[PDB]
Amino acid sequence: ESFLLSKVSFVIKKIRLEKGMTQEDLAYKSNLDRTYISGIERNSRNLTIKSLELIMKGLEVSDVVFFEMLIKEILKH
Amino acid sequence: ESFLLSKVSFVIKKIRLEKGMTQEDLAYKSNLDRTYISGIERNSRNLTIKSLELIMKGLEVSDVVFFEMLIKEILK
Amino acid sequence: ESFLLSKVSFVIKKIRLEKGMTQEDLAYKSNLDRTYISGIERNSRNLTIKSLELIMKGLEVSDVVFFEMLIKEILK
Amino acid sequence: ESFLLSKVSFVIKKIRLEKGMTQEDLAYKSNLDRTYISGIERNSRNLTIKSLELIMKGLEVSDVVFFEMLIKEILKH
DNA sequence: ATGTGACTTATAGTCCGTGTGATTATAGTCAACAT
DNA sequence: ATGTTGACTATAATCACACGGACTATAAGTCACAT
Contact D62, D20 (CB under 8 A): no
Nearest to D49 by CA among C76, C70, C33, C72: C70
| Whole-number Å distance between alpha carbons of C1 and C7 | 11
Q: How far is CA A76 from CA A56, A62, D43, D49, in A?
A: 22, 22, 46, 55
CATH code of the domain containing C72: 1.10.260.40
Q: B37 with B26: CB under 8 angstroms? A: yes
**D49 contacts in C (CB within 8 Å)?**
2, 4-5, 8, 46-49, 52
Q: Give phi and psi for D75, each to the nearest 5.
A: -80, 40
- D10-48 b/e with 16+ CB inside 10 Å = b? bbbbebbeeeebebeebbebbebeeebbeebbeebbbbb
- Inter-residue contact D8 to D71 (CB < 8 Å): no
Nucleotide nearest C31 (Cα, C1') = E29
**Torsion D5-D40-D10-D31 (CA) sign:** positive
Nearest residue to A58 via CA among A76, A42, A41, A75: A41
Best CA proximity match to B37, nearest among B18, B56, B62: B56
C-alpha distances out from residue B75 to B3, B69, D44, D64, Å: 11, 10, 57, 63
Count of CA atoms in the C-beta half-sphere (13 A) of B64: 6
| Closest by CA position to D2, among listed C49, C64, C26 | C49
**In a 10 Å sphere around its CB, with 0-12 CB exposed, 13-18 middle and 19+ buried, how is residue A55 labelled?**
buried
Residue B48 forms beta bridges with which residues?
Answer: A48
DSSP tag of B31? T
Q: What is the domain range of residue D37?
A: 1-77
Q: Is D9 exposed, middle or buried (0-12, 13-18, 19+ CB in 10 A)?
A: buried
Closest CA to D8 of D61, D45, D54: D45
Three-class SS of C27-48: HHHHCCCHHHHHHHHCCCCCCE
Cα separation, A72 vs C34, whole angstroms: 67
Rounded Cα gap, residues D29 and D24, in angstroms: 9
Query: What letter would DSSP give residue C21?
Result: -
CA A75 – CA B7 distance, rounded (Å) = 23
A70, A7 Cβ separation under 8 angstroms: yes
> Environment class of residue B76 by beta-carbon count within 10 Å: exposed (0-12), middle (13-18) or buried (19+)?
exposed
Contact C14, C69 (CB under 8 A): yes
Resolution of the model in angstroms:
2.8
Q: Which of A11, A70, A13, A15 is nearest to A38 (CA)?
A: A13
Instruction: Find out whether C40 and C9 touch, Cβ atoms under 8 Å.
Output: yes
Pick left, alpha or beta for residue B12 (phi over 0 → left; psi -120 to 50 → alpha; otherwise beta). Answer: alpha
CA distances from A18 to A13, A21, A22, A61, C3 (A): 8, 8, 10, 12, 44
- Residue of least CA–C1' distance to F14: D33
Contacts of A46 in chain B (CB under 8 A): 48-50
Residue nearest to nucleotide F5 (CA to C1'): C35
Looking at strand E, which nucleotides approach a protein CB closer than 7 A? 1-6, 11-21, 26-32
How many C-beta neighbours within 10 Å does residue A24 have? 11
Amino acid at A12: I
CB atoms B49 and A53 under 8 Å: no
Give CA D71 to chain center in angstroms.
13
Residues forming beta bridges with residue A48, ordered by sequence position:
B48
Q: What share of chain B is helix, strand, coil (3-state, %, to 5)?
A: 70, 0, 25
- In this structure, what are the phi and psi dihedrals at residue D13, rounded to the nearest 5 degrees? -65, -45
* Nearest Cα residue to A2 out of D67, D29, B57: B57
Backbone dihedral region for residue D71 (phi beyond 0: left; psi -120 to 50: alpha; all else: beta): alpha
Which residue has the least CA–C1' distance to nucleotide F15?
Answer: D33
Q: What is the spatial distance between Cα C56 and Cα C69, in angstroms, rounded to a whole number?
A: 12
Report CA torsion sign: B49, B53, B58, B63. Answer: positive
* A3, A75, B23, B33, C52 from B53: Cα distances, Å: 8, 16, 16, 15, 62
Can you tell me the distance from the alpha carbon of B67 to that of D58, in angstroms, rounded to the nearest whole number?
Answer: 49
Which of the other chains make 3 or more beta carbon contacts under 8 angstroms with chain B? A
Q: Are C50 and D5 in contact (CB under 8 A)?
A: yes
How many structural domains does chain C have? 1
Of D71, D70, D45, residue with least CA distance to D56: D70
